[model samples]
Target: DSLDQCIVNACKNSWDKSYLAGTPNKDNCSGFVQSVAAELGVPMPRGNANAMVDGLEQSWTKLASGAEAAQKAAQGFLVIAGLKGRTYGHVAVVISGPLYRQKYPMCWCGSIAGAVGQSQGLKSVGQVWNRTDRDRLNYYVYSLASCSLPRASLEHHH
Candidate 1:
């Protein structure tokens, strides 16, 4: 019914079940984000983390910093931080919650190949990826009801 619900429901199975969620799965970050967005009634062009963000950048709102991203997530907006990798890029969903004094926002990752979906619960970008990786991340945010970009209606069973 809401973006928050869509996100929570999407990852409810693994939230905090890091042992299970941490395991490498074919689902990957791309598929994870794609599915969550679709459930929010926002269709995304499924691709590797890098390409997917490139497409999203065309329409999704861009944030200047992770601090801003964190606040956006606090508002239930779907924020994504994508790191451009040499071979494979990485991406994750920024959940709506505070990480205390942490400047970065907490995120939900799918089973990433290199370093994507390693954590199961809501973890900050700092906790998810190391310092080097976090420095060069691309930040973007969107509200499903606010976006006017044309998208195909999606249908899924189970």
Candidate 2:
């Protein structure tokens, strides 16, 4: 539960406005991504969605195109879908495992006045953004060395 706990904790707060409280600082999509990426120590950029997508291959491990990339999501890897738009794009954490069962990746995102709000809920890319946006998205995955809640507790348990 270590990484899942990190994702939930990073998003346990609100993110609708600029002055959102808690550890989730800033607003909009990238801010939300930044918080979660930071929690996992993924080395993601802390700026707009465009930069986030552009700099992904530079820092994080780049995945293949289309829905194929989301397969890593099921393996507990930090999979991010980033789209760069003319004004401002979006980024999301997608869970593509059987838990979702959706043909497309289930996008857990952050936004204001967009399809989905700052709600810590799962919505598919097909359900939220249109095919156009989804087509432009670049998928990236981060492999964690370990995802234990705490190895110490498990090793010495009575």
Candidate 3:
């Protein structure tokens, strides 16, 4: 599903609290994908925890890349991931290609409490799976639709 579609699903279902456990560390991570599965219409078999997993596994089928999906659906998408910081969680969009690389369309991302807060912490700087490179990332990419406009910057807010 397109990232925006995922977000709409999340909002449609009404998901506000974080469903993850423990602090976001090199070992623990959570986000977008989880939100998508949790709210998007489909009744999960296992719930929040399992909902995230299902989202990731099904991403290929449901998710659209960047502008491709957004154009058809008419929305923005922000694909996100995780990195090292005081708190953890990441976000981003399914670009027609790579973000900032080709400059494609995107889905809007909602408020991510810790990712951008007073701590000035939590940004997906590329920390995939264990490798501590500026290119590694670990968060589920999801998007929201019909944004409130003047969307929140890449900052933290409750």
Candidate 4:
């Protein structure tokens, strides 16, 4: 229930004050996923995008190299993608995919460039759906089926 509320809250208000946990740590992409995991009673690995990806490898399954993995993903699935040649990576929550959109075209992401607490227009960075498109990184995809959340029911305010 708390996780659902968090997702709804994020859609409505980005990282609301409560979700931010009153700390600057919640401002990044991994922070957003960590916050959601914290509320969900799940154990989120601590670290930056790369660290999370490495840790998740112990439990999550690695998928394809691009959006195809996302398209094959189910709602509530998680995605951790590398920035190809860059040192940084990105993480996102799969909100819809093969089970929802025919194209499985969207996910919830936290971007330094994204609206602080709101889901803005969908952005694509590497293999992510809601990240910025400033780079052409080839992403590495991973999914956690057990941690998948329900499809987002909140209306998109943007």
Question: For each candidate, what TM-score against the reference?
Answer: 0.71, 0.70, 0.33, 0.52
Per-residue error (Å), model 3, residue 91 = 5.1
What is candidate 2's lDDT per residue for 1-158, written digit by digit as tens?
A: 43344444445542432323433333467777776666666677756778888787577777765365556665556788777778877777765433333446665677754545443555666556666665556788876621345455455526
Estimate candidate 1's alpha-carbon lDDT, on a 0 to 1 scale. 0.64
Clashing pairs in 1: 110-117, 112-117
RMSD of each: 8.5, 4.5, 10.6, 7.6
Give model 1's TM-score versus the native structure.
Answer: 0.71
lDDT per residue (tens digit) for residues 107-151 in model 1: 777654544445554567777676787767778887543323223
Which regions of candidate 4 fall more than 4 Å away from where they truly are?
1-14, 17-26, 65-87, 97-104, 114-121, 124-158
Worst 10 residues of 4 by lDDT: 117-126
Q: Candidate 4: what lDDT?
A: 0.47
Residue pairs with backbone atoms closer than 3 Å in model 4 (clashes): 13-117, 14-117, 14-118, 15-117, 76-148, 76-149
TM-score of 2: 0.70
Model 4: per-residue Cα lDDT at residue 91: 65
Residue 67's lDDT in candidate 3: 33
- Considering summed lDDT, which 10 consecutive residues are worst modelled in model 2? 17-26
Candidate 1, run of 10 with poorest lDDT: 16-25
Q: Candidate 4: lDDT of 132?
A: 56
lDDT of 2 at 43: 70
